[PDB]
Amino acid sequence: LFNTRPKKFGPGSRQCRVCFNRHGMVRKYGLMMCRQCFRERANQIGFVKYR
Amino acid sequence: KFSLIPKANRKAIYEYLFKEGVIVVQKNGKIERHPEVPVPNLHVMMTLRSLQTKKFVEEKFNWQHNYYFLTNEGIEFLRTYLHLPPTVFPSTLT
Amino acid sequence: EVKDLMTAIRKVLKNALIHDGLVRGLHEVAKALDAKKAQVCFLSESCSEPAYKKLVQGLCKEHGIPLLDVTDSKELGEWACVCVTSEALTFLQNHIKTL
Amino acid sequence: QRLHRIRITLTSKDLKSIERVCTELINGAKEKNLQVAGPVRLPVKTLRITTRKSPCGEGTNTWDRFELRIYKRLIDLHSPSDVVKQITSINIDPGVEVEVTII
Amino acid sequence: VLKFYKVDGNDKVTRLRKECPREFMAAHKNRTYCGRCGLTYILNA
């Protein structure tokens, strides 16, 4: 009637939980993390970069 | 969903907050009513937009999810509306 | 005073709004009458509309449940047209059914 | 009691957290002297994400190479289930997911 | 506002717009239609 399309798939369906942003959405292993959001909190999750 | 929440379902928000003393609501408007209390999710956001701006409840954000605490003057208000016996729910009690 | 001259109105209409069963308006009182609902009703001593005054009495005449009287058309509802779906009611209850 | 066979999974992020558990629970078995085999070290499932460092497009297109590491390790036993509950319940570690399994 | 019936004295009050209720009707032409009923109701005449 109003205020809803079919919203099931594509970038419009889903957003970053931390900052509410669709762009740059890391969905590997079911993160649902926007990249700007993901890199700074990556050490606190577990991810430690080397080589 | 949409429109003003019934006045029975106003007390459905308050009587949950009267017993437990916590109520957290997801920021999203189109999201399903919050797990726990069977109402629209917008109506929980509207009633605690209403509550915070007359003090009583202590709002605290992070993470879209809005983690409310209920103060000493807050438990006076609900009891009056609720009609609950005085000293009914101390947070000091376990 | 020695006991209390008609506080059976004012005590009950406060405490009934715990359970929420007071009904207000000409539509909703008429719907409460046209129902398996309304247990006591009220009107003004003087309101207006012979039919309006008569209708309240008339509606009751079908399915029972009486009126009384009270006082002042402004100061009817302020103790809470009224509808109501021991302790306080002991003064009213013996007047309503018995004489 | 009955002749059973138990093979307990161990997983965590740290190496140092499991090397406590592998040393402790075999010595905890050797209190009672059950039929222990040594801890079977499976291959390491290294998880990987590569994002860009910059928020916007500017500069040279540089990249992080983030990594987790996960360490599946398996203590083998042949013993009934009532015996093992004493060994596992004492000495639980911080942030180490452990699940006991018959067969 | 529910005054619009054929009102009478001593002591009956006859009604207008005969209802067909789901579990008073509007009247323009042919159909009868109930306001409060959440599913909308149609019967021509």
CATH of the domain at B66: 1.10.10.10
Q: Gap positions in chain E, given as the residue before each gap (C–N > 2.5 A)?
A: 23
| Contact exists between D and A (3 or more beta carbon pairs < 8 Å) | yes
The answer, for A9 touching chain B at a CB cutoff of 8 Å, is no
Q: How far apart are CA D72 and CA D15, in angstroms?
A: 10
Cβ-based contacts under 8 A for chains A and B: 7
Structure-determination approach: cryo-EM
Q: Find the angle CA(B45)-CA(B65)-CA(B23) to the nearest 5 degrees.
A: 65
The answer, for A4 touching chain B at a CB cutoff of 8 Å, is yes
Q: Which three-class secondary structure string do you get for chain A?
A: CCCCCCCCCCCCCCCCCCCCCCCCEECCCCCCEEHHHHHHCHHHHCCCCCC
Determine the distance from the C-alpha atom of residue C43 to the mean position of all C-alpha atoms in its chain, rounded to a whole number: 7
Resolution (A): 3.3
Residue with tokens 């594509």: A10
Cβ-based contacts under 8 A for chains A and D: 31
The answer, for D13 touching chain A at a CB cutoff of 8 Å, is yes
The answer, for E13 touching chain C at a CB cutoff of 8 Å, is yes
Domain containing E17 equals: 1-45
The answer, for A17 touching chain B at a CB cutoff of 8 Å, is yes
Q: How far apart are CA C64 and CA A47, in angstroms?
A: 77
Which residue ranges form the domains of chain C, and what is each CATH number?
1-99 (3.30.1330.30)
Which residue ranges form the domains of chain A, and what is each CATH number?
1-51 (4.10.830.10)
Of D13, D55, D66, the CB nearest to A42: D66
Q: How far apart are CA E37 and CA E20, in angstroms?
A: 10
The answer, for A31 touching chain B at a CB cutoff of 8 Å, is no
Q: How far apart are CA D82 and CA C99, in angstroms?
A: 78
Domain at D56, CATH number: 3.30.70.600
Per the structure, the count of domains in chain E is 1
Are D67 and A26 inside 8 Å of each other by CB? no
Q: How far apart are CA C54 and CA C30, in angstroms?
A: 13
b (16+ CB within 10 A) / e for A15-24: bbebeeeeeb
Of C27, C49, C58, the CB nearest to E13: C58
List A residues 1-51 in contact with D (Cβ-Cβ < 8 A): 24, 26, 28-29, 35-36, 38-39, 42, 46-51
Tokens of A27: 């969905």
Domain containing D30 equals: 1-103
Q: Which residues of A touch B30 (CB under 8 A)?
A: 3-4
Domain containing B93 equals: 1-94
Three-state secondary structure call for residue C43: coil
Per the structure, the count of domains in chain B is 1
- Calculate how close chain B gets to A18, using CA atoms only, in Å: 6
Are C61 and E11 inside 8 Å of each other by CB? yes
Q: Which residues of A touch B63 (CB under 8 A)?
A: 17-18
Q: How far apart are CA B15 and CA B38, in angstroms?
A: 13
Tokens of A22: 């669709």
On whether the CB atoms of residues B65 and B24 are closer than 8 A, the answer is yes
Which residues neighbour D19 within 8 Å (Cβ) at sequence distance 6 or greater? Answer: none
